[PDB]
Amino acid sequence: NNNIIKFDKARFTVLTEHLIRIEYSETGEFEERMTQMVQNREFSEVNFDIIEKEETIEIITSTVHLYYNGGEFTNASLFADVKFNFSVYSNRWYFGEKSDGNLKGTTRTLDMIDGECPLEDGIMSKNGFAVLADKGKVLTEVGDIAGNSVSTIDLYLFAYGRDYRQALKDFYQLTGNTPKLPRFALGNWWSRYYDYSDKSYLALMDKFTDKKVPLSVSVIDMDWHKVSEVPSRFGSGWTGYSWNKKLFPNPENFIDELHQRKLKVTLNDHPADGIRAFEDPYPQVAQTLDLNTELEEAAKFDFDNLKFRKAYFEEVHGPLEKEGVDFWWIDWQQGAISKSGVDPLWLLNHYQYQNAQKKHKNNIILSRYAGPGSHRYPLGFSGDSVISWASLDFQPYFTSTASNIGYTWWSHDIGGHMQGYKDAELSLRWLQFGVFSPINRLHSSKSEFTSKEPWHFDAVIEQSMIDFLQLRHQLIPYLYSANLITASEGRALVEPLYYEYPMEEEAYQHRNQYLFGEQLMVAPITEKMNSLLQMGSVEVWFPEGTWYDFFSGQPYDGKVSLKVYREITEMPVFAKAGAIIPLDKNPLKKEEIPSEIIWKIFPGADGEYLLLEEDNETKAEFVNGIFTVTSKKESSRKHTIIYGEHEIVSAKRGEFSIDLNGKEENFDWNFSTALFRRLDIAEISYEQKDEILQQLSLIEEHEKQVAFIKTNENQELQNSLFELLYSGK
Amino acid sequence: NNNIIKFDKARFTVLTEHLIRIEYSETGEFEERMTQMVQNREFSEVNFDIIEKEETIEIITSTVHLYYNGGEFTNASLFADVKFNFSVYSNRWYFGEKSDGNLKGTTRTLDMIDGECPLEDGIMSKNGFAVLADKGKVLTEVGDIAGNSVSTIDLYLFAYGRDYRQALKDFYQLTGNTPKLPRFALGNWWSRYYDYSDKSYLALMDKFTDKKVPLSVSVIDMDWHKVSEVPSRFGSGWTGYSWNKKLFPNPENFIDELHQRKLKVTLNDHPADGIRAFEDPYPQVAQTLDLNTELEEAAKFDFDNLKFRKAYFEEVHGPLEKEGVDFWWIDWQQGAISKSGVDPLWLLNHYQYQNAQKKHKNNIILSRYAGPGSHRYPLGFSGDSVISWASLDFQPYFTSTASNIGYTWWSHDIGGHMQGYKDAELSLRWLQFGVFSPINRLHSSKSEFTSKEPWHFDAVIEQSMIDFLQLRHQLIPYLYSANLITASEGRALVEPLYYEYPMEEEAYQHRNQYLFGEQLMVAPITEKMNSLLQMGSVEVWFPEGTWYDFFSGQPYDGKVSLKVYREITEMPVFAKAGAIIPLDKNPLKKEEIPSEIIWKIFPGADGEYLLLEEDNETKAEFVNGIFTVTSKKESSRKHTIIYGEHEIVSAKRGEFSIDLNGKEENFDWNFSTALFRRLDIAEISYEQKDEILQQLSLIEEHEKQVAFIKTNENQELQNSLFELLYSGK
């Protein structure tokens, strides 16, 4: 290509104006094969300039000067200046050195993490550049490990400035797009490390139905297989591939019952102790792998070994798949050691994801993060988080930041995995976040005390959990459409604020705040409520424009940073004037695609929404007060229209256009009602409640209502009252 | 041997079913010579299985699968699975990696340690396996350093599960048994970093006698030699080999006076500055080592050098030994550097222990820990601990954990060495521990304020210290018998609870609690007393069975974890029903072996005790209430029998049998007396004392006495009263 330049023992490939591959080869041969990370180096031709001398080369694009002075790559011989002024003297990359500015990415797991842990770098930087080292093995054409690259140094310099979305799109072009998820992945999952029987698991699935909680996925954790029944001469029962016949006497019939309830079924797989001589598949595996059965030779876990992988997929998983297991939960915690030097977690996710496509279209796994490019193998499984306010407070930041290395389908144990402390409000706050996260999978530890069942809790917590779990299914149309946008356009469902607002300092100062698809902005509450107010709070940054609480219609004039207060049953989620959000009208109804969609419109601006589905595209447009719905293909689907407060049209078939210029724009939300409710629940003096209600009702001028609350001795009560006055301004 | 297998460049030796040597050699030659650590690889033949293929080998014993995949040893090529289920996924050893579970061992020294310090691994693990790397030099047949092993990797995989005592016995078979100590080592030692004269040292030894404190050892610290009198051109006076003639004008006569008092004598040796030209032995050493005397060439410390070692033993130590020095206190603090790569501390302990056997049978040194196998050179000397409650609180755990690397004769500075803070109760608690430790050596810093003399303190502390110092000499028969059991059977005097109770979780949760020989269980108090109770406390785990306070007879029904309270003058030490403890009846009487033994019997079960002595074995048996004493050889020894409370037989000669079925089984200890004493000393309100005494006397039902104390506002007083109610149940 004209986009390739060789100099001394180095090779430079200008992939985009903002992305340069940098290689070193001792042997004069450079690597064309794919790697664990890189799937594609075919990019459209771009313009750049070169200054090539006897001893030095300079490559010049719109955004970077890359310099190479010959010899081995050192911090002195290989370095780059960006053509940006985001910093005073952090604008230079030096080979092998770290600079300030990296917005971070993700890490393997939250196992044993109570609150924060360190993250790896991503490709996004406030200073406009990042280097992504390719240290992986080469692949063959069909995707097996081929050994060591002949490019013994192979780097990708990203110099996208603060065009983070383009950086991520081009990262997906280099490393491969995220595959499409199946719609079932986006519903509620039930999971618990608990020794259910077939009977008690079905009873619980039937109780969810009776309780009006919709589920898409039934997880069965490790007590599906033998555990205490494993003789100790074999080691533990952590790894298992044999049903516990007491609990599951007829596994296929049990899985058939979950399938009749329209559930997908996954089993926990702890692979590290392989297939030992007590296991039901051991005689077949022993025959295939020529094991010494009289010395009970184990088929040890070895995902570098083609014959082992084949026996694992065909003879260990295969029989369980025939019984109706839909996909695999790979729960790998036993380290990064293999003879090849490839992390066994990477070998599991890569080969198991590929194997899962044989039985079902667009199938998934559930496994931990295996490094850059491992987004090709959804879903992410963060693991054994400690049950704490601190863990919840980290998790939104964790989730949105992961988009910076393209890993956009994290599934967290909703409510936390293990250890930690009981607090029903923590459980409820965690579920609110989970509903507005990539995947909503309830899971817990082996404790008798950690079930995430809503009815574990009091009547208030129970009803709120059921409400949010129903909301998750209402959101599946929006989630599935965003999923197809991830797969086709390389846009994350969960974005940090700085993707949309890269030049706004406040977009970097609200770590737990994020965009959720294109129409919603979420600010989860991740701190225990103030008992004096009976409300939790978070500081929300409202960008320029008019924003509405998604639930209440409470309005906010951006741009402003404002502390917002919500009761434990309520979550801060916001939509702009002109937002159009589809919702399943029948979230409890078992059906492949919604028979009815609610179009929820926020007045005050034009807008539009494209609902992508398996077999259709439906465009909702709101222009000069006219709402129009059209689709590629016709269907019997019935559309409901909600304009602000009011249901305008109920269950109307086919394409149509309705004029909403006539209709009531304003939500009911009003200062006086909200004021009365905040004062009423507060655990403060009745004399203070009486004085605040009286004075805020009597005082007419907005500035004097604010002066009145400014004298209040309760500082947090001032901030709560200020939120209502700001919304009522 | 059939117990030897070669594969690729590796050699495996199956020493036991649970112990495998693993070697790598580039040259095809493997090491048969002894090392600093390993003295013996002759073990009886054992059965095991092999699966040997073209590219891999598996060795299978009753407890482990060892795998080697060929090539250099890496975490991928060399690894082992244990045949135990003590953990879910910590059952695999990987070459060069650490696993969870190690119960730890010991470290060189407590120099400058205030409380806890990190310890090295031992051979014991809760998960059932440990690797002990042999990184030492090879020895010649006679025990000199021969250079580098030809086994450039040489490892010992221990896979004993929780059979910790067998692991330790087989470690002693590999590394050599601990030698027998001499009986004098087990008595009280006096030491102080203080510039005594011959006259003032003898006066102090005569004051111990007048004060009824028995001593076995007289330590003379570094002010024995010139210190301030050393010209500064030579460096410091820390190293010295020349008597200070002002303080010791006639050293042999002074040592003769200590010998007439039946004391053994040791001098501090700081070896690091060698033999400099001012020293009394320098002219002889200079002649032997061909030094340049007109340039005052020093004989620098060089224990790699055969001629230096010979001149050190014969011409430096030899003259002081002729004056009557019995053994050497090696106080080495000057680092681990030598030309050979052997730690100078190891060279000192190895060669000085060997040299000490020339002048006396079963002689000792006193020196810091020099790594695995250095138990062959007793005694351990932990050094310059900081005087603190924190240091004392670490020391029992430190001492029992050291058994896990076979280093079972730690001598700690009793009361702490230096710095820290005055607290007479800390001094008394420390001496209580020391009496129930491997060695009871009182020692202190150069301060005018840190003497460990009992009469330094008030009359209460003084009497209690004298009482415990007398108890140490009463215990010498028991200690000397345990010493011969260490030397002959490889059983530690001090064991962690988990040696006896490996499957009891509570045996891992009482770090300062230990077995002391086979008949006593000790729970030292290592925290300042609660001034409200005037008592200190420790949580004691009582194993299954009936236990008695060794001192009071207070009973405890196991299994239970119970906080116990003792006045500062009292120590928690416990014996089971059926325990038989010999005691010297005449601890102040200077005599080589006790002329009279008290047999202290705890009623309620059968038992037995074997008293091993220099020239006799005496068996005490208690079966169906009949007490029998027999011996290999006859003697004039007189036996006293104490059955629970009562002296049954006084000063009876020879073999005999007495029936104790007739005699009073029960101790005097009673709830009411103990209750009155705890309330009486407590610094609480008299109204509370009156109400507790009245209500606990009136309320008849045990459950209602416990309910009454459960309402007490003083939580620690509740726990103290609960201990008495539990013992009275």
Numbering used by the authors:
A (entry chain A), B (entry chain A): 11 to 739
What is the paper's account of this structure, in its own sentences?
WT LlGH31_u1 was crystallized in two different crystal forms (named, crystal forms 1 and 2, see Experimental procedures). Crystal forms 1 and 2 belong to the space groups P21 and P6322, respectively, and comprise six and one molecule of LlGH31_u1, respectively, in an asymmetric unit. The P21 and P6322 structures of unliganded WT (named WT_P21 and WT_P6322, respectively) were determined at 1.75- and 1.85-Å resolutions. Despite the space group difference, hexamer formation could be generated via the symmetry operations in the P6322 space group, and the hexamer assembly is isomorphous with six monomers in WT_P21. With molecular assembly in the crystal structures, LlGH31_u1 probably forms a hexamer. We performed a structural similarity search on the DALI server using WT_P6322 as a query. However, the superimposition of D394A-Koj2 with WT_P6322 shows that the estimated distance between the Asp394 and 1-OH of kojibiose was 1.2 Å, indicating a steric hindrance.
